């Protein structure tokens, strides 16, 4: 119950949240980019044949 | 003006920012996903008719 101790403990928790939030943000952004790339590739493949 | 008090007050502010940032990130990601889904649905609907 030291005045510094229950502050050090909260300092421990106040950084894993930031780290995990960054990780989830990166995962979401990468998934969105991959989906967009797959969609554009399929669209181009479909688009060539009708022109020909 | 207690040495712990003006630290507790800053600890108060140093978490709502993280919470709101997470909320805004989720909102943006969901909006992007919904837009992509709407675009792909419309593209598929347009794509079937020209093939037929």
């Amino acid at each position: 119950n030291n005045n510094y101790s229950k502050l050090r403990s909260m300092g421990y928790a106040l950084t894993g949240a930031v780290q995990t939030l960054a990780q989830i943000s990166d995962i979401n952004d990468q998934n969105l980019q991959q989906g967009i790339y797959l969609l554009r590739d399929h669209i181009v493949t479909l688009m060539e044949a009708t022109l020909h | 003006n207690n040495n712990y008090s003006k630290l507790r007050s800053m600890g108060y502010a140093l978490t709502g920012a993280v919470q709101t940032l997470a909320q805004i990130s989720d909102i943006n990601d969901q909006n992007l996903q919904q837009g992509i889904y709407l675009l792909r649905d419309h593209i598929v609907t347009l794509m079937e008719a020209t093939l037929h």
């Binding site: 229950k6 502050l7 403990s9 909260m10 928790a13 106040l14 894993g16 949240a17 995990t20 | 978490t15």
Partner: peptide, 13 residues
């Protein structure tokens, strides 16, 4: 959410 809640719990005492 639990981490932020514990952060807010580690200050009311």
């Amino acid at each position: 959410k639990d981490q932020l809640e514990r952060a807010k719990a580690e200050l009311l005492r």
